[PDB]
Amino acid sequence: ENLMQVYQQARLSNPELRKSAADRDAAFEKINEARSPLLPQLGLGADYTYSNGYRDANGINSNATSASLQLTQSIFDMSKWRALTLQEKAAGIQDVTYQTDQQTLILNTATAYFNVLNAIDVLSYTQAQKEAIYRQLDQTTQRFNVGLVAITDVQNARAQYDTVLANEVTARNNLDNAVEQLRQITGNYYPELAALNVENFKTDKPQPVNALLKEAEKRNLSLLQARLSQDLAREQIRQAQDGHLPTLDLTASTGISDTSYSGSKTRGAAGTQYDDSNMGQNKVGLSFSLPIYQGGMVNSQVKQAQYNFVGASEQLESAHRSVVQTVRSSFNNINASISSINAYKQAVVSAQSSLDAMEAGYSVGTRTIVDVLDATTTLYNAKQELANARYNYLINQLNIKSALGTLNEQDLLALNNALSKPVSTNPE
Amino acid sequence: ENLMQVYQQARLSNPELRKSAADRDAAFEKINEARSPLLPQLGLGADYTYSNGYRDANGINSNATSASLQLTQSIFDMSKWRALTLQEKAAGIQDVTYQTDQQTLILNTATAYFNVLNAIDVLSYTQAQKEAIYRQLDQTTQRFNVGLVAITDVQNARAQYDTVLANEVTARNNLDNAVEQLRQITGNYYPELAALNVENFKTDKPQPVNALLKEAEKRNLSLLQARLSQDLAREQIRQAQDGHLPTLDLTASTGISDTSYSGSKTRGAAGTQYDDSNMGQNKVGLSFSLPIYQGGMVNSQVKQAQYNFVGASEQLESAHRSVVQTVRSSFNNINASISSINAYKQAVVSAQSSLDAMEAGYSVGTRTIVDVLDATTTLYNAKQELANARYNYLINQLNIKSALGTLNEQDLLALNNALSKPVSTNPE
Amino acid sequence: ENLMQVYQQARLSNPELRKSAADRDAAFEKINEARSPLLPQLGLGADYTYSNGYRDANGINSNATSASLQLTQSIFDMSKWRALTLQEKAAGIQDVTYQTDQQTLILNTATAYFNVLNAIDVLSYTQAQKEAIYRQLDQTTQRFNVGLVAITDVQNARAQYDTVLANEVTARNNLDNAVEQLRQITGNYYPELAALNVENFKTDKPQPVNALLKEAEKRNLSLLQARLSQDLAREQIRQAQDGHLPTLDLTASTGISDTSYSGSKTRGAAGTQYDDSNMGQNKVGLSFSLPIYQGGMVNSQVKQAQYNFVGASEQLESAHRSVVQTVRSSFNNINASISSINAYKQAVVSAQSSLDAMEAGYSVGTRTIVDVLDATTTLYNAKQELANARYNYLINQLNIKSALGTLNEQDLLALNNALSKPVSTNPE
């Protein structure tokens, strides 16, 4: 119903908080399995092989069988540690985006909630606006019952009556789709929700803009994430340089072999050479290798990981201009939002007393009923400008606080405290 | 010209019926090559090797040369069955979306055909609207030829005349880009196309909404496709468990070797050891391997494909709310569509006789010619939006029928039967 | 400030000429490392192995430290050559895209420049339109100070006055976001920019349309890029058939081993066999292998790069209809741009003298001040449509000429010479 509970009814029932929770727990499980090649390895083998000779080798035969246990452990790696560093940068990026999944969750779930309530309230001034068109249409037709005016005012109020019928029909459809927004993110139908107390509405002034360069350049998730990808490109420089490294190896392998004998050249002149033994063997191993001449494959990957480093530096420049653009664009959205809201209050008041002055001008007949529906219509327009711009002001609150990246569930909770009384969803 | 034949022109010359047909034949051809590693493998080998010795090998020399023939066969795999049924669930995903390429083909080619008809007919009422502004403009200027009215009526209707000139200009460009719907999608041009019999139109009432929960959840391609990816993820759990499995191996080979002899310590005190033989060899092979200790990537992708199992479960939840959203949103689109059609029919009536009583109201002079052009313009809005209420209702027909997944070339054919008389595609 | 210098201040400061030049130098550096497997490859090895027996084999022990020098060279490949010429189709398609990055960067730096100019000019027309609303509003209120008019034009002009306040507020915001377009792309702030000398602006007639099928089908980067992807797919057909090729291989190695001895059953009846001195060894090798029976993986990839052959062939059909769509759509955008501009100039003249004859009709009182603000409003609409349609005209020059792919820094310079005097950003 109200905000944070629907957030609860989103935080349990967002398929992308559960999908993305599956992403981040898959990413930390991915840290676990990226750690998994660091372990030793153990396995068994066995084989059977027949032999036969010819071409100055015919007459001697054999069959051979063996088994072997093998456990290995590396005596050099930086790459699993490297891919563990890129692994933790990557799952840390997944936590950055996952904070953008709770941040996006509150952002578009609360935003979508404001679209639901927005379709309720714009649909509501559509309703009362239709009521005004039907009152002046109705009393106009009543003046036609004695025969005062030509029918085209009645039928222009009928055609525009069909227009506001299309507005409550299609805006009714927009609220149906808004029920598919709470049914898209939340999943269900709520017959009423928490509306807005428009009475205590105030003009909160935002932060200084270069202070928001500090808030953005300190508190962005995105170019932080470009530092993770960019330093990750430095780890790809050093990972090609892991491509330049020598190595040592540890292995272990026991095994058995019998290798029975057969053939014409085998039996005869054997002399204890061809007697059957029961061979058992225990083995250990090491292996050094050095990169003498790779052919220069590394120092191409170094340069291209520098190209990812400076390109990702241009993703901190892209993200720099982008979230500079977010807090400054959003900043001016708050500015023209607030000042435009002041114009909406004076437009509502001047449209109200001007509406009543059109009631005066129509009571004396200097202006027709057309201007009555123009100050009426324009009045309801300014009603949706002010109230809907309160919703867009709420979106502006999500622009500043979500642009901060520190939008918690308590900013979400305070915006739940901004709410008020429940209003139904499907009237007639 | 008519619908389905252009669909035939789509079914021959959609580059994604052809290219995506090639994608689905790439998927089934990929079932063939996904089956291909299961087959035995036969190949050749040959090598030349020289030896030279020093320091306990100084004076003994040799060289080596061998040939070989190798056919192998696996005596375990289950992963190629899930390469193969990844390949068949996912080839069936390509058939899901390729049935959504005929469904998308009819969808956006018939939709785009309705955009061509939309540009022709909205542009046509733009033409006749310009004719109305030119009859009252020309008639008003004709009454100015004796000097009845003010010139600002003639020049306001010259600015509005330039406006409807601009509307037939850029809506002429929408006809040009509609020729780029026929030419972007169909590839070609028609001088005229089969329009809509708008005169016999009726309001069909759609299905019950929960019957479309059963019907939509019955014949969705998308979350069926998520079940393909999702049981696919279940055998990625069980394909990490294919990594948990032991194995047996079959190989086969044969070869020849000569190994001529040379050197100072070689010849002398040989004693039949260094006589030349020309060894021939036949070999078979089997190999077992045992998952004794595998580092713990074991069971990790079990967990991560549980995050893909719940992942595609939230893609069947996302797809669930998405196609519930599609047929319910589309349902309300048909509702406000039909009721809006009623609104525009009453707008045709009320704007019609209201326009005629503005001809009366202007013949008496109580209203100016401005209101005549406004009820005229509004009447053409009831024309373009009753006719485009029919056209968006045709899009609504593709919203229900394409949202069902039941759409075929016979629903396509029935919408070709809905067509009528051809109207030209380049008038003046 | 003036155009191409901003481009200069965008060419050094494009994150995607730096990013994407880093991509293309990554592609050329990837020609280098794509050549690096073709090089002879040299490296070192060293290892050590202990022996111990049991089960009728107990009592034998030995050890050997081997070092090895290994240089290899292939005596068949076409794949690294086709990786290298897929690296020339990748560096060459990457050059197609990077010419589309200079091309697209000029396209959107000049486009975005026109958007900044658009926000400035529409903002200024909002300014002077507000000035007209305040002159007639103020004069109207002063006529109420003697008592001539009704207050509903004063307060409806306060609703419209607050409206144009909200329009210089939100168009002030479009200015601010346009500063975030110069700060999004240029990255910085400019105090003023080059306004257009609109006085010498004239219409230029475009090229013949089938001649633009020659210029487009000759001078597309995109379906050229589909040709490179397409012959790329032709030697993916024949790179599968490179998978059908037999092959020969050259290897080289040497090194030492030590092979000392220990044990209980080792010692006893040695006879010069168990004397310790440390071996040296030299080796080479070859490998010729033939696709005798491979399971038929190839001839599926052949058909699927026929599916990629019709992939990029129906991307040359998709790209064909797309750039036919680009220059025909853009062509008719030039046409409706020109004729619409002519309608805008006649809207300027007819709305101007119509506005003056509404000043006559209001000075005599036959029409109210509402029509004065409608011809005023519509006049400023002809201003914004006119100069903004000059931005539509020049942006159509970017559409057709960037559609030719020969839109260069000199067409950038030509439109830089189309500029004139600078106007600042932020007055009151």
Author numbering:
A (entry chain C), B (entry chain A), C (entry chain B): 1 to 428
Sentences reproduced from the published study:
Drug efflux pumps play important roles in intrinsic or acquired drug resistance to a wide variety of currently available antimicrobial agents. AcrAB-TolC is a RND-based tripartite efflux pump, comprised of the outer membrane protein TolC, the periplasmic membrane fusion protein AcrA, and the inner membrane transporter AcrB, which cycles through three different conformational states during the drug transport process: access (L), binding (T) and extrusion (O). A small peptide, AcrZ, has been identified that modifies the activity of AcrB. In this study, we report the near-atomic resolution cryoEM structures of the AcrAB-TolC pump captured in both resting and drug transport states.
The structure of disulfide-bond stabilized AcrAB-TolC pump with closed channel at 6.5 Å resolution. We also have developed a new procedure to stabilize the full pump using disulphide-linkages that were chosen from the proximity of residues S273 in the β-barrel domain of AcrA and S258 in the β-hairpin motif of the DN subdomain of AcrB seen in the cryo-EM structure of the full pump. The full pump assembly, stabilized through the disulfide-bond linked AcrAB, was imaged in the absence of ligand. The reconstruction of the apo pump at 6.5 Å resolution revealed TolC to be in the closed conformational state, like that seen in the crystal structure of the isolated protein. The periplasmic component of the pump, AcrA, forms a hexamer through the trimerization of two conformationally distinct protomers. A gap is present at the interfaces between adjacent AcrA dimer pairs, so that the AcrA helical hairpin, lipoyl and β-barrel domains do not pack tightly to seal the channel from the periplasm. This gap must be closed in the transport process to prevent leakage of substrates into the periplasm. In the ‘closed state’ conformation, seen in the apo pump, the constriction is maintained by an inter-protomer hydrogen-bonding network, involving R367 in one subunit and T152, D153 and Y362 in the adjacent subunit. The quasi six-fold symmetry of the interface between AcrA helical hairpin and open-state TolC reduces to three-fold symmetry in the apo-form. We propose that the apo-form of the pump with a closed TolC represents a resting state, while the pump assemblies with opened TolC in the presence of transportable ligands represent transport states, in which the AcrB trimer adopts asymmetric LLT, LTT or LTO conformations.
